Amino acid sequence: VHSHGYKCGTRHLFAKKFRKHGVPSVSTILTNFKVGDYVDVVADAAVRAGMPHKYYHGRTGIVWNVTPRGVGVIINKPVRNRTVRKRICVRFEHVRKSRCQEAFKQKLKDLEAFRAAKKAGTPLPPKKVSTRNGGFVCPKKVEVLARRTADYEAMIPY
Amino acid sequence: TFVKVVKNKAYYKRFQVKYRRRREGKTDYHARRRMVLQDKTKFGTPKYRLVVRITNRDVIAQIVHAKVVGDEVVMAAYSHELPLFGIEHGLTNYAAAYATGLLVARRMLAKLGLAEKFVGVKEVDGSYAAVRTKDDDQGDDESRFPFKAILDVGLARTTTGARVFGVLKGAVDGGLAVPHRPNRFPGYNKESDALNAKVHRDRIFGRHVADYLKQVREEASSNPDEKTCQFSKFIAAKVSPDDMEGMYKRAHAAIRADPTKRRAKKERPAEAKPKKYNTVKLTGAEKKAAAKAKVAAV
Amino acid sequence: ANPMREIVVKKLCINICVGESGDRLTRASKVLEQLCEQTPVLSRARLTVRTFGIRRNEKIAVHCTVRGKKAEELLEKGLKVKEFELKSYNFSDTGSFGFGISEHIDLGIKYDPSTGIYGMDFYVVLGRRGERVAHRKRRVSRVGFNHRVRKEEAMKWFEKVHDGIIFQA
RNA sequence: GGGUACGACCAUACUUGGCCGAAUGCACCAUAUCCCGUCCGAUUUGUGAAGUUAAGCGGCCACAGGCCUCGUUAGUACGGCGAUCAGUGAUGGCGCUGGAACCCGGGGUGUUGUACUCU
RNA sequence: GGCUGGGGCGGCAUAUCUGUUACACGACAACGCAGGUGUCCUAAGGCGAGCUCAGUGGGAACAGAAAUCUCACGUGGAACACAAGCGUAAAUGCUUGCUUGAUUAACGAUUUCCAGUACGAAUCGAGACUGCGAAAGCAAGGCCAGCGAUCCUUUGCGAAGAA
RNA sequence: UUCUUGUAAUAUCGACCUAUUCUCAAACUUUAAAUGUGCAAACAACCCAGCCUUAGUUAUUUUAACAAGGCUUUUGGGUA
């Protein structure tokens, strides 16, 4: 059985990788928040505080909190027969807003905007096509296949 | 210099690159990063960066908000506007750094109207006042963040010569409110902590200059050289060391009294004018033919 | 052409190795000191060698860096000792050169037996007009090739003034 | 359009070499009384005038270097799927599903905000 | 005692830390592989500023390969108290400068391991009070191992006032 | 060897340089799968108003901004 640091390491994961070294950007810091955001978790390294244990990068949870430097994310962690919500104390630097949800809503409103426009706003306005289908065809030059060995002396392994 | 390394693709492979103004070596982020950073928690409150700048003997001021996709300059002015306000020779010195701060401060805060909240002394002893909110005697005021902010540097030579100190002082008094630890102004001992505002004021009132514009010439005058070699404009455009305080003093007042911006030639510059001497990226298809014909040749 | 494109001495770079320290080094210090009338910089050993019979952090040399008129003078003096005759081998190609001399009095320094004498190491750096780019932080930058020196410029410079003779062929 | 400047983005932005640069400006560049700071005015501090675009800087150039980027490779490889089947054993094997890296080719070679300027 | 390819023995796989096994989430055994821990450190803490390596060349009395000196390179290849691993370069390094935040708390809130006990160990606020700095800011002793119930002892916990 | 012998030349083969080049990794590694792994997919919603409130934002509300939440008869009002 194995050794256990709460920050017990790995091979090639935590290490800060391919030209991706160094501090978080100021863009990172310019960000802005509100709570309830569904944001995803990543690990810089940078400061080895506010830094989750292993579970958590690549997972999406929801923020419940914004503290000075940091934000609270409750995440559902799967134990036995359940997922428990865990509320984790990160400083802001280790988390980011997805698109996961964004689209859904985005579309939903956009669509509504259109659906609404379409009735009950002014205009009227084509989008898409159906799915997939049949068709007339006037092709104009079919081929076939003849494979391997003819002129194999030109090619193949030795 | 010296070499035996690959410096090619494996090298490249083995190169990281650092930020643009490190490619440039224009700006060192760490502090900007740290300066810029703002408690989110405390809102999206506007954490303003004051851009603080000197070119090779030239002063530049701006009031900024730091931002993505570029930061944003709300106000700025620099040493050649001081001519509107009559300080025209002077522009490196401690005095001229200062001046610049009072103006911009004022114009910006005139931007939110404030001719007067935060519009300070006119004395310019060269002492200290921090912040806190106080009352309401000044004016031209309103609810949008009361106007304090932070200095953007990139050179910790915070000496008792450093005329960053000057600008600040004007900056602040003319409108700004970044306070500070008053510890290395001109005439200021940290050690056994002492301020001679007076001399700092003297520095703000160029008297070191006055004297150096004394010392340099009329004395040196005995001989033709030294006298023939610096401050040329200054006594070429003839002032006398003494005159000094007035112009500043009144400038200061004029500035503070109204900052309201000077023009420029102003009709549209020329765009074709610069582009007129340029080159742009060559033509490869063609280049291949050009190179190709040559290697074909010799 | 050239408009102003100079060649200048950047700075004079003396070293006095004292393979040991203490008194000989302090004693040396005074010499080197007065000579340059500066605060020379002390060099110590910086590792224990044992082959040299020296250790780490000995205080094993002073050296001093000199700028200004003084240098130019000193240059000539030392060249004087050395009567303006030098090895090509004395030169880094980096656009500098050095030579060692035993004995200091001929530099022109008034003898005293107290100090006595030392054998010292002399180093000469040369520069050009307008150099500043490679030494002022913000947007410090490497040197333009058409300002990049080499050894030649200096030998030619020497021949032109101080009237270099390069030994050799 | 450039410049300037603050950028933001952070390599098509990069090493390397040429060639060239109007303006504004940058720049180099002089100085060190003051302040300032340094063995050292090199840095820095302080002053800033004479020079000088040589460098920088800029822009371009380049069977340049690098990157960038696509294609190419290759449904191979490599996975997924099977009761089944051949196989000394690995395997190999089908049809059902997915799916390369390198290579070479090809092309590409910073983007663009904010404030300022410069007809 | 146990442990354990029987017991014994040896070994410690018994609290443990690391890296690796281990299937590109997560989790996974062996007396598997390769390693560690019982301390260390008033700075090796903490903060600023400054400074930049590993490494290579060229020169420079003595001095030669190896002294220093010095130019000059040089994506860290170092270096960072330490095993190991992570990170990382105008710093996190490194040097200097200054310090005591290795501080004090209603100390809630928080995580990890997980029984969703625990300790241990971590994370996030708030209050102090300091430090440091130009300033944003940082600073609750590099980050991860280096550590301890009930039970017992002991050390520390208002004087001062107004009844 | 020619040269004394050469910090010689010239041969000389090595060292070294360099580009070349084979063949390779559990604790190597750019890139990088497949196969997996988080989340998200609705009304307790959207908007529009205009509200309420805040010892939220070194404060200036105020016909500030934002923040923030609370509201909101017949949605208040609209809106699937």
Determined by cryo-EM
Q: Are strands A60-66 and A70-79 parallel, antiparallel or unpaired?
A: antiparallel
The strand order across the sheet containing B48-55 reads B72-78, B58-65, B48-55, B150-152
From chain B, pick out residues whose CB is under 8 angstroms from the CB of A66: 40-41
Q: Angle A87-A90-A96 (CA atoms, 0-180°, nearest 5)?
A: 95
Q: Which helix (H) or strand (E) holds C42?
A: strand C41-43
Residues B25, B30, B35, B39, CA torsion sign: positive
Backbone angles phi, psi at B256, to 5 degrees: -60, -35
How far A53 CA lies from chain B's nearest CA (Å)?
24
Return the closest-CA partner of residue A59 out of A76, A81, A72.
Answer: A76
Contact A66 B37 (CB under 8 A): no
Strands B150-152 and B48-55: parallel
- Please tell me which residue of chain A has the smallest CA distance to B46: A30
**Residue B144 forms beta bridges with which residues?**
none
What Å resolution does this PDB entry report?
5.6
Neighboring chain A residues of B48 at a CB cutoff of 8 Å: none
Strands (E), B14-168: 48-55, 58-65, 72-78, 150-152
Q: Which chain A residues are within 8 Å of B37, Cβ to Cβ?
A: 26, 29
Q: Which helix (H) or strand (E) holds A96?
A: strand A95-97
Alpha helices in B37-92 (DSSP H): none
Answer whether A50's CB lies under 8 Å from A90's CB. Answer: yes
- Both tokens of B159, joined, read 């000496």
User: Count of CB atoms within 10 A of residue B210's CB?
Assistant: 19
Q: Which of residues 93-152 of A touch strand F (CB under 7 A)?
A: 98, 100-101, 104, 108-109, 112, 115-116, 119-120
Nearest CA distance, B268 vs chain C (angstrom): 32
Tokens matching residue B208: 């070191």
Least Cα distance to A34 among B46, B41, B37, B38 occurs for: B41
Positions of E strands within C86-135: 96-102, 119-128
Tell me the shortest Cα–Cα distance from A42 to chain B, in angstroms. Answer: 19
Within residues 196-225 of protein chain B, the ones with CB less than 7 A from nucleic strand F are: none
Q: How far apart are CA B171 and CA C47, in angstroms?
A: 53
Contacts of B33 in chain A (CB under 8 A): 23, 26, 29
Residue among B187, B191, B141 nearest B160 (CA) = B187
Give CA separation, A67 vs A63, A155, B12, C77, C165, in Å.
Answer: 11, 68, 41, 70, 75
Within 8 A of B27 by CB-CB distance, chain C residues are 138
Separation of C36 CA and D77 C1' (Å)? 74
Report yes or no: B222 and B113 within 8 Å, Cβ to Cβ: no
Q: Which amino acid is at C38?
A: Q
Using the CB atom, is residue B273 less than 7 Å from strand F? no
- End-to-end Cα distance, chain A: 51
How crowded is the C-beta side of A117, counted as CA atoms within 13 Å? Answer: 10
Q: Tell me, in Å, how far CA of B253 is from C1' of E91?
A: 46
A29 interface with B at CB cutoff 8 Å? yes
CA distances from B263 to A124, B15, B80, B101, C45 (A): 50, 48, 12, 19, 64
CB C151 within 8 A of CB C91: yes
Residues facing A96 on adjacent strands: A40
Query: Residues B152, B155, B156, B160: is their CA dihedral positive or negative?
Result: negative
For B285, the 3-state DSSP assignment is helix
Does the C-beta of A20 come within 7 A of strand F? Answer: no
Neighbours of B162 (CB within 10 A): 18
**Contacts with B26 from chain C: Cβ below 8 Å:** 138-139
> Is the Cβ atom of B140 within 7 Å of strand F at any atom?
no
Say which amino acid occupies A51.
Answer: M
Contact flag for C and A (3+ C-beta pairs < 8 Å)? no
User: CA C92 – C1' E66 distance (Å)?
Assistant: 21
A and B: number of Cβ contacts within 8 A: 34
Selected residue of B35, B37, B65 to mutate for chain A interface (largest A Cβ count, 10 A): B37
CB proximity list for C114: less than 8 A, separation 6 or greater: C27
Contact B36 A26 (CB under 8 A): yes
Q: Which of A117, A35, A17, A109 is nearest to A72 (CA)?
A: A35
Q: CB B70: neighbour CB atoms within 10 A?
A: 7
Query: Does A47 reach chain B within 8 Å, measured CB to CB?
Result: no
Contact residues for A132 (Cβ-Cβ < 8 A; gap 6+):
none
Cβ contact C104:C31 at 8 Å: yes
Distance between CA C158 and CA C166 in Å, rounded? 9
**Cβ–Cβ under 8 Å, residues C44 and C24:** no
> Which region, left, alpha or beta, applies to residue A119 given φ > 0 means left and ψ of -120 to 50 means alpha?
alpha
| B120 φψ region: left (φ > 0), alpha (ψ -120 to 50), beta (else) | left
Laid out side by side, the sheet with A38-41 consists of: A82-91, A70-79, A60-66, A38-41, A95-97
* A and B in touch (3+ CB pairs within 8 angstroms): yes
Residue of B nearest to C142 (CA): B1
Yes or no: say if B168 and B52 are a contact pair by the CB < 8 Å rule.
no
Q: Do C137 and B25 touch (CB under 8 A)?
A: yes
The pair phi, psi for residue A109, each rounded to 5°, is -60, -40
Cβ under 8 Å to B: A residues 85-124: 92
Q: Which two tokens stand for residue B119?
A: 């519009």
Whether A32 sits inside 8 A of B44 (CB atoms) is yes
* DSSP three-state, residue B5: coil
